[PDB]
Write a protein that binds this ligand. Structure first.
Ligand SMILES: COc1cccc(C=O)c1O
Ligand SMILES: [Fe+2]
Length: 525
């Protein structure tokens, strides 16, 4: 059966998200008192903010949009606010400069990811960021982030866009993966390509809880590398280099910003915290592969840097292939890489010119978007909450971003892993942790994540108590599906300005519109 209206032409290209999903969503608005199944824990007090790519206009500017990447689309923030067991929701697009241009124009004006040479001539010198990767609340300011620009600030209640680069960073970029130190409260981070397209410059920074840059350093990466994420320790920021290289002449020629390079080893840059000289920075190397996201890092008793990450044994973004015909054929040959969760040891007593030890396999299954208990950010941690391909219950052939159908709770100290399965014909997104109370043990609390009910065309938020990780306590049930997203964060009420007085939805007025005389009811009747 085919419905005659279904063969009518769309002017939309295939606009995928990371999951492989291709349905544009693009709504902006609210639901007060989201339908829930089961009981919402009264211990949740805060907001789960999630950010997705969801092109607002059909991205047809360059080559009819046929090369749009899953990481490209205009950032939209879904907020799910948990107060006294009620849950409200708000979604709104980040009003990036790019968004504004395209909405006002009713027209795509931007080309390839990170390639201004493929943007419309009138926009080439704009901030090209779609601000669609990650969010943070720092020094009372709520930020949407993408690594090709500074952050945009938004109002945390209305999600109205307030401004660009609120912390006034001197770099042209900020990572979407800054870390908030649990000891100092510093937003610790960096920005690479810090001086413009294909620059090797990195700028390291620490922003104190008052919003001031208290520490910074300019340095360079050994090549212009895709430095997506990092790990924070008490004495280091550690930058994680993926084996992609940027090339200006390739960009000028209308090619991709990045090209995977099998010959590049995974490389780490140790930046001593508050370093006085770029002389203090070291490069460490292993072998080729793609560690996507760190869980976190710390320094062990002997001062060794321990980091856990996912590890994909090859290219997890095949839409950015190698330059050479030779490496192109190797990517095709390799198909879907081996995918695991691994532990790295960067011992600063050793010569950084020596190849790193092979990382230890922690989980031998496809693993991604890890989070921790943030009360342990930048110090020793045990808990990780990992998005996973469930062992024996998942495809295997799927790209790492496209078959994530469970979660894992790993605890290094106990050496145990517990597992949550999203369901048949379901996918589950990145987990976030909220502690049971202020003083609860590490990883004691509630884990939330978005579930795609693929057979129902709707999305839901599952809530799981760490005392039984196998089972959902509650499910927040949207009446629709939202885009599969990138990162999200549990943001405590206590660090949110005016969380006690402002909901995601403004209440209507108390006063009745109508006079008493209009009531159909007469108490004397
Ligand atoms: C959404 O935009 C992005 C840019 C660069 C890397 C990643 C990886 O998750 C990403 O999601
Ligand atoms: Fe990321």
């Amino acid at each position: 059966y085919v419905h005659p209206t279904d063969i009518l032409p769309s002017g939309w290209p295939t606009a995928t998200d990371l999951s492989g999903g291709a349905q544009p969503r693009r709504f902006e608005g609210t639901i007060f008192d989201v339908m829930t199944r089961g009981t919402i824990p009264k211990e949740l007090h805060g907001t789960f903010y999630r950010i997705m790519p969801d092109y607002a206009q059909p991205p047809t500017y360059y080559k009819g949009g046929e090369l749009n990447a899953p990481i490209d689309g205009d950032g939209t923030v879904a907020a799910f606010r948990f107060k006294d067991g009620k849950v409200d929701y708000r979604q709104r697009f980040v009003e990036t400069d790019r968004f504004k241009v395209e909405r006002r124009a009713r027209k795509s004006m931007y080309g390839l990811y990170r390639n201004p040479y493929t943007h419309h001539p009138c926009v080439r010198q704009t901030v090209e960021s779609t601000a669609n990767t990650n969010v943070v609340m720092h020094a009372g300011r709520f930020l949407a982030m993408k690594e090709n620009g500074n952050a945009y600030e938004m109002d945390p209640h209305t999600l109205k866009t307030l401004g660009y680069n609120p912390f006034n960073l001197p770099s042209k970029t900020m990572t979407a993966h800054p870390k908030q130190c649990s000891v100092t409260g510093n937003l610790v981070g960096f920005g690479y390509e810090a001086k413009g397209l294909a620059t090797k410059d990195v700028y390291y920074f620490e922003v104190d809880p008052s919003g001031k840059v208290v520490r910074d350093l300019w340095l360079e990466a050994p090549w212009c590398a895709f430095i997506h994420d990092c790990a924070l320790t008490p004495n280091y920021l550690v930058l994680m280099l993926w084996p992609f290289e940027a090339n200006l002449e390739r960009m000028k020629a209308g090619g991709h910003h990045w090209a995977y390079d099998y010959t590049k080893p995974i490389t780490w840059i140790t930046i001593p915290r508050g370093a006085k000289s770029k002389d203090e920075v070291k490069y460490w190397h292993w072998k080729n592969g793609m560690p996507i996201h760190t869980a976190s890092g710390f320094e062990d008793e002997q001062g060794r840097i321990i980091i856990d990450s996912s590890l994909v044994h090859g290219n997890a973004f095949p839409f950015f292939p190698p330059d050479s015909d030779e490496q192109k054929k190797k990517q095709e040959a390799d198909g879907t890489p081996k995918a695991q969760f691994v532990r790295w040891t960067i011992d600063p007593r050793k010569d950084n010119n020596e190849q790193l030890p092979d990382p230890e396999v922690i989980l031998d299954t496809p693993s991604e978007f890890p989070q921790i208990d943030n009360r342990f950010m930048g110090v020793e941690y045990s808990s990780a909450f990992i998005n996973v391909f469930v062992p024996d219950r998942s495809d295997g052939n799927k790209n790492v971003f496209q078959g994530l159908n469970g979660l894992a709770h790993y605890k290094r100290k106990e050496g145990t892993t517990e597992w949550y399965y999203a369901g048949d014909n379901c996918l589950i997104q990145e987990p976030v942790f909220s502690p049971r109370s202020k003083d609860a043990p590490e990883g004691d609390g509630f884990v939330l994540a978005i579930v795609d009910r693929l057979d129902l065309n709707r999305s839901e938020v599952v809530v799981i108590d760490t005392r039984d990780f196998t089972k959902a306590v509650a499910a927040v049930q949207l009446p629709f599906a939202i885009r599969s997203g990138i990162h999200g964060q549990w943001i405590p009420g206590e660090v949110t300005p005016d969380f006690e007085t402002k909901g995601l939805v403004d209440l209507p007025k108390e006063e009745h519109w109508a006079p008493l005389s209009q009531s159909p009811y007469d108490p004397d009747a």
